[PDB]
Amino acid sequence: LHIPVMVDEVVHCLSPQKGQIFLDMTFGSGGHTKAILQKESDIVLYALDRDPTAYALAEHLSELYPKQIRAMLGQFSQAEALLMKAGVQPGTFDGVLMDLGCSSMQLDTPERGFSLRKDGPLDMRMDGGRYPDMPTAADVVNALDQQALASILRTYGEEKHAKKIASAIVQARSIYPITRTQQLASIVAGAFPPSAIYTRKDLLQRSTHIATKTFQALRIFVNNELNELYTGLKTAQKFLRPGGRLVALSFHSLEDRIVKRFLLGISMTERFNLSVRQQVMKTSQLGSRAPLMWELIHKKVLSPQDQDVQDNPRGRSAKLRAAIKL
Template sequence: MIGRGDDFAATGEAAPHVPVLLSAAMHWLAPRDGGLYVDATFGAGGYSRAILATPGTRVIGIDRDQTAIMAGFGLVDGSGGRLTLVEDRFSNLNEVCESQGASAVDGIVMDIGVSSMQLDRAERGFSFRLDGPLDMRMGSDGPSASDVIAAASQASLSRVLATLGEEKFARPIARAIVEARKENPIVTTRALAEVVSRVLRPRPGEIHPATRTFQALRILVNEELDELRGALIAAEAVLKPGGRLVVVSFHSLEDRIVKTFFADRSRVGGGSRHQPELHHAPPSFKVLTRRPVVAGDDETAANPRARSAKLRAAERTDAPAHSAEQDDTGFPSLADVMKGH
């Protein structure tokens, strides 16, 4: 829990759980008096609270989940006008900053993925631990996971599970889902988990057989990988020279996108004496963490979710932002899957 030495002790608000790698995130973000920061994935407000513990800081918090925004009103009231919350996708963070009169900011922190607030609410449909509607949407718009299950072809489902869930048994699981939905629509988390469990039997000491299937559907429904790429590009556009970007990810697909983005944006040249020098745009970032920062034994013991977390940080240079075009990664898109492609 966050200690009571910050500005919010007098509000009477219960302190939230410390987010994963909080200490490391604040070390690399290095908030300073008078700085303006973006908590691009507000969630329960843990990072925002930690930033605001530095006197004189201001924070723009973004979350596409209306529930998270509403739950943060108490923190806004206790901030003395230093915290502003905006309901939006974090890929739109540059437009959000502009709407708040901020043309540039001193730092941005992103905690990628689903929050415990979402996992612990059965009605949100994120977890097979709790039976509820098969929804998984972080916002309130777009197709739900049950819509995807109902509309996607067997080939599309197999590709989604294999690429976004890194599921080795994607084909038999997809086949089982298609056969099961012929009998009854799959509209609850328990129903989907049971279908997967008929293909992959649970084994003691291993993750639940449906874990990767649920991960794949959640990533697809919320277009998380495209959102992440868009957010990194937006961060590059809005950070001041010397401003820092800190990203905490929880699985290899996310971490690979962050690592590749930082490598591309920090590249200073190429070639050799045998090859002509490659021409690159001037580096827009300086990488601060050559290797990802991971949680220590104490943190993973207290919070098992921290086991898979990786933190990467980089500092903005004074070079212009690179091209804002996003590369086609080859991952399945929600629109194509819903068309049965």
């Protein structure tokens, strides 16, 4: 079982109260959505997900609360149109809970293809066939050139060995099609000496497969999570009430940066991890930020309790960024 990550913080943060309408742009399993419909019995809630399996769960769970929860299906970009059909263009949503990442059910079910450990079709697509033409991870690896595929790994996977892990994929695909998760994992391992398979470690300091950065990289290029995250936040702002509390959850750095640089106005094209020294050097050259539209409830990113991390290691990297619209 997967407990909703930081459910206690997200509930306190949004303080759901009677007379307030809320949105959920990532229903998924619905653990967070259900934790929010428990504290306040008079709450109004809206749900959304990219997975039709997740949208069916919400529809089945809608029986528990007939109108307090309203289920919707679609991507972040398509969310505004879907909600615009309802007619809530101003929205006046008190809070938008934009949980991020892959659902526990999505990656616990081997058929969905998200787990390298198990053997499933190399789908790695949050979409559940709602768009049967949407390329899957298998398609991405078999088509793109080394330079193109290396960029996917480098930019989205934070993978130093992008050229080494991409060349192995290019050679492997020629010999046979890459259609299964384990088939890819073995190819990526084959780019390195056999001992490399578990040399790398996580921040938890527990050995991880040497292809855990290629499964994350493709997952984010197949589902365009990063570009869809920028529109998703923007749409929330337009549909978010003034004085309404937004709450995001970033499990990896790339998504965390966008949430940080969006709630603070920082340009998305600035250099990453800028030090104070570099900031001085940057502006010294020019010598020769706009008003913020948010009020961060908690100034610094929250993180899961160390005890809770061991119980749910999947959510160890959950960085909660809360803000109030201005």
